[PDB]
Amino acid sequence: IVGGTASVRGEWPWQVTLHTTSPTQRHLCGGSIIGNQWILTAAHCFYGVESPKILRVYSGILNQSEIKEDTSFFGVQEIIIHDQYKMAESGYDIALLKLETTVGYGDSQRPICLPSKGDRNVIYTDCWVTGWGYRKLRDKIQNTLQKAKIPLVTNEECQKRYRGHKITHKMICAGYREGGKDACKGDSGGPLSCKHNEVWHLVGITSWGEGCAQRERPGVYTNVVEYVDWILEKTQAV
């Protein structure tokens, strides 16, 4: 996160840190708890990931220093990547992780609500991007979970900012015209959470952008409301 501040413990209880153990253990991507065995993240996180056996999901973490060999995590049973996904810049940048065990809900770890189909017309005024990513393009994974409040940008304005790309309605952009506050390397897959009628909704999945927090280069997120039926298909299968 560029231009962010340290979060408080339990502020984003749906935020997870997805680690890979190959070749050594390290933070790979952010993610969100959406169900007791379901993590919603970005499909691009799994480039070259051959098996779910190298993945570890950590919930209820404020600081990366909380994670040692003895720290409990959730194993990943299945990686489900959207069938139409090719690359982040083309859309469909969405994946589900089916966990090997159930997440026990509490004040440190709980699910974020998916946006409603009726909430497609609603205007979100209080949106936040969170993660352990870089603070500048050449930086490092941060110890403490950072947060930044960012305004949502219309599809029309976002398309003006990205000539040469096709910004579809399955994408949602966010950022200040002048830049300064945005997601950066290591934040991808994490949430873009918006508070509406005192309830937090998973509005976007941190996906891509040209650089980090650049003037007139908003962050591009998977527009979660457009994938609600896909999420239900995968998580509510008979």
Ligand SMILES: COC(=O)Nc1ccc(NC(=O)[C@@H]2c3ccccc3CCN2C(=O)/C=C/c2c(-n3cnnn3)ccc(Cl)c2F)cc1
């Ligand atoms: C040695 O340890 C490390 O350096 N760890 C470390 C650990 C993890 C990442 N993740 C990434 O780079 C991941 C990642 C993960 C898997 C496969 C590929 C990629 C590439 C994209 N990506 C981002 O985080 C997305 C950046 C991003 C962004 N940036 C543009 N350029 N940089 N940021 C601007 C706006 C928005 Cl919305 C973004 F979402 C990097 C370094």
